[PDB]
Design an enzyme around this catalytic site. Structure first.
Site, mmCIF file in Angstrom:
data_model
loop_
_atom_site.group_PDB
_atom_site.id
_atom_site.type_symbol
_atom_site.label_atom_id
_atom_site.label_comp_id
_atom_site.label_asym_id
_atom_site.label_seq_id
_atom_site.Cartn_x
_atom_site.Cartn_y
_atom_site.Cartn_z
ATOM 1 N N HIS A 1 0.823 -1.240 0.000
ATOM 2 C CA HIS A 1 0.000 0.000 0.000
ATOM 3 C C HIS A 1 0.848 1.277 0.000
ATOM 4 O O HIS A 1 0.415 2.338 -0.477
ATOM 5 C CB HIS A 1 -0.917 0.043 1.237
ATOM 6 C CG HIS A 1 -2.146 -0.800 1.113
ATOM 7 N ND1 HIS A 1 -2.103 -2.175 1.145
ATOM 8 C CD2 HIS A 1 -3.453 -0.469 0.957
ATOM 9 C CE1 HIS A 1 -3.325 -2.661 1.014
ATOM 10 N NE2 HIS A 1 -4.165 -1.646 0.903
ATOM 11 N N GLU B 1 5.370 -2.188 13.642
ATOM 12 C CA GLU B 1 5.025 -0.773 13.455
ATOM 13 C C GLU B 1 5.082 0.031 14.752
ATOM 14 O O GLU B 1 5.365 1.218 14.717
ATOM 15 C CB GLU B 1 3.662 -0.586 12.762
ATOM 16 C CG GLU B 1 3.633 -0.951 11.270
ATOM 17 C CD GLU B 1 3.424 -2.431 11.030
ATOM 18 O OE1 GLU B 1 3.293 -3.202 12.017
ATOM 19 O OE2 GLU B 1 3.350 -2.811 9.846
ATOM 20 N N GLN C 1 -7.232 -5.226 4.103
ATOM 21 C CA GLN C 1 -6.728 -4.076 4.893
ATOM 22 C C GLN C 1 -7.586 -2.824 4.851
ATOM 23 O O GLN C 1 -7.174 -1.771 5.353
ATOM 24 C CB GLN C 1 -5.284 -3.723 4.523
ATOM 25 C CG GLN C 1 -4.298 -4.757 5.001
ATOM 26 C CD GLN C 1 -2.949 -4.593 4.377
ATOM 27 O OE1 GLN C 1 -2.091 -3.862 4.890
ATOM 28 N NE2 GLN C 1 -2.738 -5.286 3.262
ATOM 29 N N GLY D 1 2.568 6.409 30.419
ATOM 30 C CA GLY D 1 3.163 5.341 31.245
ATOM 31 C C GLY D 1 3.077 3.968 30.601
ATOM 32 O O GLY D 1 2.756 2.984 31.270
HETATM 33 C C1 LIG Z 1 1.317 -1.107 28.180
HETATM 34 C C2 LIG Z 1 1.218 -1.263 29.676
HETATM 35 N N1 LIG Z 1 0.818 -2.455 30.228
HETATM 36 C C3 LIG Z 1 0.728 -2.593 31.603
HETATM 37 C C4 LIG Z 1 1.036 -1.529 32.454
HETATM 38 C C5 LIG Z 1 0.945 -1.710 33.963
HETATM 39 N N2 LIG Z 1 2.267 -1.708 34.620
HETATM 40 C C6 LIG Z 1 2.807 -0.658 35.350
HETATM 41 S S1 LIG Z 1 4.295 -0.913 35.973
HETATM 42 C C7 LIG Z 1 4.306 -2.415 35.329
HETATM 43 C C8 LIG Z 1 5.528 -3.275 35.593
HETATM 44 C C9 LIG Z 1 6.688 -3.004 34.644
HETATM 45 O O1 LIG Z 1 7.651 -4.028 34.873
HETATM 46 P P1 LIG Z 1 9.160 -3.865 34.355
HETATM 47 O O2 LIG Z 1 9.198 -3.351 32.946
HETATM 48 O O3 LIG Z 1 9.883 -5.188 34.442
HETATM 49 O O4 LIG Z 1 9.788 -2.739 35.301
HETATM 50 P P2 LIG Z 1 10.013 -2.906 36.900
HETATM 51 O O5 LIG Z 1 8.915 -2.188 37.617
HETATM 52 O O6 LIG Z 1 10.036 -4.355 37.297
HETATM 53 O O7 LIG Z 1 11.335 -2.239 37.145
HETATM 54 C C10 LIG Z 1 3.147 -2.743 34.610
HETATM 55 C C11 LIG Z 1 2.901 -4.055 33.915
HETATM 56 C C12 LIG Z 1 1.429 -0.317 31.884
HETATM 57 N N3 LIG Z 1 1.708 0.740 32.649
HETATM 58 N N4 LIG Z 1 1.515 -0.196 30.503
HETATM 59 C C1 LIG Z 2 0.814 -5.322 10.398
HETATM 60 C C2 LIG Z 2 1.191 -5.446 8.934
HETATM 61 N N1 LIG Z 2 2.338 -4.843 8.476
HETATM 62 C C3 LIG Z 2 2.724 -4.946 7.155
HETATM 63 C C4 LIG Z 2 1.939 -5.660 6.238
HETATM 64 C C5 LIG Z 2 2.411 -5.732 4.799
HETATM 65 N N2 LIG Z 2 2.814 -7.091 4.426
HETATM 66 C C6 LIG Z 2 2.043 -7.955 3.671
HETATM 67 S S1 LIG Z 2 2.748 -9.390 3.402
HETATM 68 C C7 LIG Z 2 4.066 -8.974 4.255
HETATM 69 C C8 LIG Z 2 5.209 -9.976 4.363
HETATM 70 C C9 LIG Z 2 5.034 -11.023 5.475
HETATM 71 O O1 LIG Z 2 6.272 -11.705 5.631
HETATM 72 P P1 LIG Z 2 6.314 -13.122 6.385
HETATM 73 O O2 LIG Z 2 5.574 -13.053 7.677
HETATM 74 O O3 LIG Z 2 7.750 -13.532 6.595
HETATM 75 O O4 LIG Z 2 5.549 -14.124 5.371
HETATM 76 P P2 LIG Z 2 6.049 -14.550 3.866
HETATM 77 O O5 LIG Z 2 5.270 -13.737 2.857
HETATM 78 O O6 LIG Z 2 7.505 -14.275 3.664
HETATM 79 O O7 LIG Z 2 5.766 -16.021 3.731
HETATM 80 C C10 LIG Z 2 3.999 -7.670 4.757
HETATM 81 C C11 LIG Z 2 5.072 -6.991 5.578
HETATM 82 C C12 LIG Z 2 0.750 -6.255 6.699
HETATM 83 N N3 LIG Z 2 -0.060 -6.926 5.887
HETATM 84 N N4 LIG Z 2 0.406 -6.159 8.046
#
Ligand SMILES: Cc1ncc(C[n+]2csc(CCOP(=O)(O)OP(=O)(O)O)c2C)c(N)n1
Ligand SMILES: Cc1ncc(C[n+]2csc(CCOP(=O)(O)OP(=O)(O)O)c2C)c(N)n1
Ligand SMILES: Cc1ncc(C[n+]2csc(CCOP(=O)(O)OP(=O)(O)O)c2C)c(N)n1
Lengths: 554, 554, 555
Positions: free
Chosen positions: C28, C49, C112, C418
């Site tokens: 795309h 991504e 898509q 966070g």
């Molecule tokens: C995307 C996401 N998922 C879950 C949480 C909840 N959360 C807050 S702190 C934490 C622990 C992070 O653990 P780590 O990266 O190992 O750092 P640590 O506190 O052990 O030093 C989580 C899961 C968040 N803030 N963001």
């Molecule tokens: C989240 C996402 N990112 C990018 C694409 C674009 N895209 C379509 S096919 C493809 C290749 C996938 O490679 P792989 O998982 O190794 O399978 P293969 O085609 O090599 O068997 C990509 C990046 C998509 N469809 N979805």
């Protein structure tokens, strides 16, 4: 007898029949973790909310039931959006429970607050709503479940503010409803059913095409009765494929893609009964290449918008696909006789064999393992005891060519979103569902796609989930590299090579069994060994990149 | 043979069976006006897009068919949003066609451009979409129509950019599809129907309650057969009321509000069959005041979320209400004789009479015309030949008290939105629909509410639509004034008096017949005369403000 | 001279001055890939991504410039949503370019297509818009860039349908605009400037607190002049911290968290000049624990809604923070000598030292390496030549305690979202920006957080980006485990342990240098060696879980 909002959530889930959740911890949603702990309800905690979301999808798809995902405020929610979108286009019943900022702390620029999570989910859910009072929790959870489970199935977001979940209320002040929603879908008016059956009777070359709604209600006993009475061959998109596994061979048309060659063989269907298969990506859009323009089409779908979306139809029926299958089986049971369709079924069989044979003839593993040959190695192990999940691109396109002649317990491929990488989470959830069913889950993914969720090998090991992850490794984002070569030019490859990394080495570092193979013999050995043990595994399979799968050549 | 996008719109509407549009002109949508002119399809052009949108609603509601509203870019659209919202909560099938900025002139800060119309309509439509290509017009018009007409009915927004409409294409390059969508709604599984009938047969005091979905499909013959076979009394919310008009008196329970007094009379129903009647404003929410907590409830609705929304139910069926009524009639035409329900039906009648007599006993017009007496004057003229549209607040609450005794051809009142002023446009559209039905439309509105759309007297006169507009004039925004007095204090009236203006004088200045009355005799004479001639009329009725309608208290 | 929509995108980016994009391929958006190829503009292609989006953020943040992320339709877009949300709350200028379904194939249930991507991005962007005509590409790309770069900075989504990008048009049929947008932001009215300076002059205990907008414009010379003229100590939230690196030690208050202990010391500021630091998570909300209720507050922010959001203020000025710093420097270059503030600056210094010493006195590595000690090992290497990126939870809370006394070239920590895991992509992008600056990027992350984007070791190796990834490994989602133990009960730990996996082994399997360490000596040795080579590395550091960081203790 004071209980938290989180306790109310879990009590309502238990009453609805939910037995597993998939998620990732946060303080915002701790009350739900604590309630689950108290009630011995497992929360399968992943390494990414995306994988948890996709697991809830995989659980729903593999087990034909509600999937439940559980994520925290802010990035917990935003990390779950690809699962939401995938479930949206796939018509998959998943309840996404998300935490959010406390209502009492609104607009204070605080931690994980300020994302309008309901607005973000609105375009990609059947319903999305933020709970305003602790006392509303049970009725709104049950409402959300009814939204998700009803035809056409799909995802729902219920956003549960931190203070709403932490709030304690008298347990006797709020009722936990039952899930009171008929298991039987609505069926066609008898006049419509009679008309469809008259058309089916009169056709020379009728076919049935199943889509995802057929799989969600899983009326296989009724489908078998109908198909046995009428002798009409049945095809399916990817999501509908496993519904063909219990049917007599003569009536198994396989994947709907196989219809492509029928016109050239002077054998295009003259009648197509589409049961939840939409006009769209998997059915040749409005091209007439699979569903002929010359055919009369009877289409049954719970969403009226879909009826004849891209092509003129003869009869447009709004009803539940499962209910309709039941009704068709009931009607044809009262019938003395149906037209003999042995010759037509044999034609269907012969055309499938001609495709397969053609591919087999063209495929060579002389210099590197051919994707078709690698696919065949997997096919020999596929039966009712196995769920196959497919990711990558070239990878599933090749795999699809071997899938019609086998009878998988489950088959979970990309849908319209075609989001590379969703397969790992999907397969992990599927394996949880499969445990109860005595099934083994096999993920077949590409080297590109596996990188999205590769941390989930840790989850397989911590949870002792025996998922087998087969990586078709062509050192590239393959289908996209093909696009560059074919659509732009041979010297125009850029951003698509992936000539690094030992994926089985990554699996091994997470404690899973690692294998690297590069031939039919070595792959067969590795796969047989992996299947013989109840252990998670990664099989890294070196495969040729250059071959163009038929679906791509088309 | 080159034709405009607007011509494609109109060809598709015609093929769908559309015979009238409501709207207000703009250049952005002129191609649609020109095509309608060519094809002799009337566009009823109003003095406000809101009146046009509400007219499309009234046409849909009174006619049990699709309404079509047509508005221009920008303010044309934003002026239509109250109709969209009203249609949304009322489950009314209206196709809103709106112009929008040209795609080629996107982001130029130009005239009428820059409003995200689809985003604005998204929370209050079944579907909202902006057309990207002229060639897509017929398929997307038909898709939108299928969305609006399918269960539960509702509004759809199709946004048509100016360049998309003005673009010309070879007529032979785009097919105009048929509307291929079954007229028959999906029905319950026979197991569910069997259980419902088993419960209905065992009940001592069963009632049926109809909602809007029953009026949309208008399965009157089937309803009559079912009701005659079972002898079960039938109630309705406002929208379902006219569906009781063809029933025998003994099984006419009338408005569902009448269930209020049953528990205190030791006569609460023990079974309630809800057919498209939601738990909510018109059914007593989850209070149990109308639908008893002690009753077993069978609920049938096309939206699973609604099933037991606010109260526990025994059986929850997702089906079309019309399909269900057909199914119930079919089943009761073939089963055993049903238990006699004469005594229960007489109890229903006596309780309704006791309510009516109590109000009659309390109502006095000694010093000013009493709203109940004014309502009785209207009721004298209500039968199959009449559609009653109700607006205002105290006005419709009083009017409701006389409506169960009569058998209106149509009755269109406020739904959940309760938006004062929607009545005028609604009634104008209803009168258009009523032309082919041989019906006369009477709007009963408040002095406050009539002000919203008072310019539509002009439209009645220009289009020679014989709508009779009766203004119950208590020189105030009445219900709101009562709120201030009852909930705040007698010295706390502010912003609610309207002690100015000659509404009949305004109507006369627009060329409509005007009357000003203040007694049962003067009102009776004016209404009789207005009904005797096919001319638009305004009857300005001086009524007392102080009396409190029973429903206000409740 | 027929060129594609994708070529128009790239010509416009080039004219704006964009030198890198971060993304992941899809058909795309291939026309953009092909145009970058032709023009020698690198696209750093990642394994997710999300990592690409966070990389564009890190590039913007470390580089004080526009970040550009490039993603395909459908799942390409949805995988970028966490970066978008993070940039939104962090006020980070990133242009997210996404593919989407072809307009001509609208409503065909195709691959898509069907995700209302603009609707999804609307609540978390300054602007989101789907392009309707190929001819509109240059003007709308430039419009998007102006939206992202203007105060307050933030993310923009430009959605580019497949046909719009593949369509070819005469290259001369459209003009590619220049980026014509003043580099110098708007400044306060002189009356407001005079009032602010009068209050600053009269104050007994004035402080300045910098926010992210100070970092985006990086008016370092003006800040230096202003601070030298007034002698007023300067604090910052995480995002403002690196703006203190060129100031004399006496005027470096460091992280705004340090203000906590001031009231008990009878030393609460009586005046606070907030320069794009919002009332919120980093500034103590409306609690008055850092910004005292008794202080007169002068707040300068480009968003009027922020002004006194959670607390009454004395003077609320809508202006650009950089423009305001320039205005303040200009004014104080031509007014009377300012009161000497040596005693107050010394008090600020003393209180910071008391905090640090107190932590040092309590911290022991007798049985396992203490997070504070591990943080000290890192701090020894932090100067202008280093960007520090921080992820995890307890990990960054501990790390924060050593960051005020060093002078980082860059410091990129969690903001309001966070979101655990954003650090890996962020650091990868930061390392790309840091290349031209001769800086070395160090990610300090948790064992939990690193799992989110662990495939990016592959990208580091493929692109030879010498990012050092330090994993503070306490075998748990740590802060969340502390929550369970402290707020619920010692026996209520569920879903928070992570007692599995060799992260250095994973790094190694992707070809990166792996280290596993468990002491001050071993960690010091590994870090010294990793810093000596321009190679990507993973240092897996076994640290204690039980210690509670002061910021958690306060909470
Ligand atoms: C995307 C996401 N998922 C879950 C949480 C909840 N959360 C807050 S702190 C934490 C622990 C992070 O653990 P780590 O990266 O190992 O750092 P640590 O506190 O052990 O030093 C989580 C899961 C968040 N803030 N963001
Ligand atoms: C989240 C996402 N990112 C990018 C694409 C674009 N895209 C379509 S096919 C493809 C290749 C996938 O490679 P792989 O998982 O190794 O399978 P293969 O085609 O090599 O068997 C990509 C990046 C998509 N469809 N979805
Ligand atoms: C669009 C809209 N504006 C305001 C209201 C609030 N409201 C409820 S009842 C009422 C009074 C209506 O007065 P009138 O139409 O004269 O009827 P009355 O109660 O006097 O019979 C008002 C203004 C509303 N429901 N809808």
């Amino acid at each position: 007898a004071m209980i938290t909002g989180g306790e109310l959530v879990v009590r309502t889930l238990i009453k609805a029949g939910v037995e597993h959740l998939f998620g990732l911890h946060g303080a915002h949603i701790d009350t739900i973790f604590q309630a689950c702990l108290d009630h011995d309800v497992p929360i399968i905690d992943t390494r990414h909310e995306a994988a948890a979301g996709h697991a809830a999808e995989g659980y729903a798809r593999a087990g034909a039931k509600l999937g439940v995902a559980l994520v925290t405020a802010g990035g917990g929610f935003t990390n779950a959006v690809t699962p939401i979108a995938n479930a949206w286009l796939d018509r998959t019943p998943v309840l996404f429970l998300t935490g959010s900022g406390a209502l009492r702390d609104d607009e204070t620029n605080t931690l994980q607050a300020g994302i309008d999570q309901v607005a973000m989910a609105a375009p990609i859910t059947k319903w999305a709503h933020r709970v305003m009072a602790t006392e509303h929790i049970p009725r709104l959870v049950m409402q959300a479940i009814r939204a998700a489970l009803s035809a056409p199935r799909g995802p729902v977001l219920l956003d549960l503010p931190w203070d709403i979940l932490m709030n304690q209320i008298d347990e006797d002040s709020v009722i936990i409803p039952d899930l009171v929603l008929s298991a039987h879908g609505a069926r066609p008016d008898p006049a419509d059913l009679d008309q469809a059956l008259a058309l089916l009777r009169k056709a020379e070359r009728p076919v049935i095409v199943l889509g995802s709604e057929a799989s969600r209600t899983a009326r296989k006993t009724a489908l078998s009765a109908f198909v046995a009475a009428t002798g009409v061959p049945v095809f399916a998109d990817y999501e509908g494929l496993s519904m063909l596994s219990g049917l007599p061979d003569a009536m198994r048309g396989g994947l709907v893609q196989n219809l492509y060659s029928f016109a050239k063989a002077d054998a295009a269907p003259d009648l197509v009964l589409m049961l939840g298969a939409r006009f769209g990506l998997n059915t040749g859009h409005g091209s007439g290449q699979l569903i002929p323009h010359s055919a009369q089409v009877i289409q049954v779908d719970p969403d009226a918008c879909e009826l004849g979306r891209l092509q003129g139809i003869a009869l447009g029926i709004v009803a539940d696909v499962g209910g309709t299958i039941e009704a068709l089986a009931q009607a044809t049971a009262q019938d003395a006789a149906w037209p003999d369709r042995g010759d037509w079924c044999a034609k269907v069989t012969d055309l499938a064999q001609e495709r397969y044979a053609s591919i087999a003839a063209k495929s060579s593993s002389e210099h590197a393992l051919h994707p078709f040959h690698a696919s065949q190695v997997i096919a020999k192990h596929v039966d009712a005891g196995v769920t196959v999940v497919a990711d990558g691109a070239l990878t599933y396109l090749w795999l699809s060519e071997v899938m019609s002649r086998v009878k998988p317990g489950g088959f979970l491929c990309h849908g319209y979103l075609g989001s590379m990488g969703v397969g790992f989470g999907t397969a992990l959830g599927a394996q949880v569902a499969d445990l109860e069913a005595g099934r083994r889950t096999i993920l077949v993914t590409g080297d590109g796609s596996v990188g999205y969720s590769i941390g989930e090998f840790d989850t397989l090991v911590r949870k002792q989930l025996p998922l087998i992850v087969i990586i078709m490794n062509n050192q590239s984002w393959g289908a996209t590299l093909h696009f560059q070569q074919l659509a732009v030019g041979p010297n125009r490859v850029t951003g698509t090579r992936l000539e690094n990394g030992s994926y089985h080495g990554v699996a091994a570092a997470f404690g899973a069994d690692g294998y690297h193979v590069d031939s039919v013999e070595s792959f067969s050995a590795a796969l047989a060994q992996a299947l013989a043990h109840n252990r998670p595994a990664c099989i890294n399979v070196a495969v040729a990149l250059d071959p163009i799968p038929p679906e791509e050549l088309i």
